[PDB]
Amino acid sequence: LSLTNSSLMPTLNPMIQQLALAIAASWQSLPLKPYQLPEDLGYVEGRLEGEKLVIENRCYQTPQFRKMHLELAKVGKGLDILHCVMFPEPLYGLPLFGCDIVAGPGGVSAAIADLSPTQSDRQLPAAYQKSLAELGQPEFEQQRELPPWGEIFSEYCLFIRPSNVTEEERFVQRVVDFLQIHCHQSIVAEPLSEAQTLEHRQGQIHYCQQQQKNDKTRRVLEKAFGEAWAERYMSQVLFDVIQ
Ligand SMILES: C=CC1=C(C)C(=O)N/C1=C\C1=NC(=C\c2[nH]c(/C=C3\NC(=O)C(C)=C3C=C)c(C)c2CCC(=O)O)/C(CCC(=O)O)=C1C
Numbered sequence: 001l002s003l004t005n006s007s008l009m010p011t012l013n014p015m016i017q018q019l020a021l022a023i024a025a026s027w028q029s030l031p032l033k034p035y036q037l038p039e040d041l042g043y044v045e046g047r048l049e050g051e052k053l054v055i056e057n058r059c060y061q062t063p064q065f066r067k068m069h070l071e072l073a074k075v076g077k078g079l080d081i082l083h084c085v086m087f088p089e090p091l092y093g094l095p096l097f098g099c100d101i102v103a104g105p106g107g108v109s110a111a112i113a114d115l116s117p118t119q120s121d122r123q124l125p126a127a128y129q130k131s132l133a134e135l136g137q138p139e140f141e142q143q144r145e146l147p148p149w150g151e152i153f154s155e156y157c158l159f160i161r162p163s164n165v166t167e168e169e170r171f172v173q174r175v176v177d178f179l180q181i182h183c184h185q186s187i188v189a190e191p192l193s194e195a196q197t198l199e200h201r202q203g204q205i206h207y208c209q210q211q212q213k214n215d216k217t218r219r220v221l222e223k224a225f226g227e228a229w230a231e232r233y234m235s236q237v238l239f240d241v242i243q
Pocket residue numbers: 071073081082083084085097098099100102109110112113114146147150159214216217220221
């Protein structure tokens with residue numbers, strides 16, 4: 001998590017760098033253990049007929065978080081991506097933290113962040129609702145509408161094109177705030193029942209199945225590695241469906 005040894009970090013959009021730093025700082029002092037991705041993946045690069053895709057991966061776990069995945073990527077020289085998901089252990093019923101940032105030479109094109117529900121009523125837990133509301137309604141000039149598969153995201157989901165540095169900073173701070181709420185709730189939550197655990201597991205399964213419908217991610221992977229590789233990557237590395 002010291003991103004000191006990342007080859008991509010120095011080269012990424014500044015908002016991405018600040019978000020990577022913030023995620024790493026959130027995780028750094030937790031009771032981390034490694035999480036081995038398929039084929040013990042770390043760095044990977046590929047090219048077919050166009051630009052090369054370069055990816056760096058970090059992945060951990062804790063008793064409360066099944067899988068804590070930070071991925072940085074770059075397509076060619078211009079397109080930078082940050083992907084992060086904290087997948088909860090269903091036993092504790094925590095929501096899913098996620099963020100996705102896409103940037104090119106013109107700046108950040110997409111900034112998405114959420115604490116996504118796993119309950120069958122599609123609501124966040126009561127404590128999360130309360131803490132999130134207390135942050136106030138952020139102002140962003142260039143909101144983007146989620147695609148249909150994005151029904152999985154909460155009412156607090158951010159999906160914007162930042163308009164200026166002030167908005168970039170506001171977005172990062174809201175992610176810092178989401179992480180602070182999430183980490184705190186993770187120590188105050190225990191534990192639910194076998195029926196509740198099963199409910200939460202289903203919510204996480206559904207989240208991953210829906211995330212796999214993102215053709216924007218899929219096309220980037222396919223253009224560098226092909227259809228079969230992209231399908232394996234999306235279903236096994238990014239959005240693994242638990243059992
Ligand atoms: C918590 C949410 C969340 C998580 C965790 C997550 O992984 N994605 C999430 C959301 C989300 N992503 C989106 C977009 C894009 N994502 C990529 C690429 C990659 N994203 C990666 O994570 C990897 C690994 C990529 C490639 C290697 C590109 C290129 C775009 C288009 C950017 C643009 O339009 O300006 C959209 C909008 C979808 C739409 O408009 O139809 C949503 C909603």
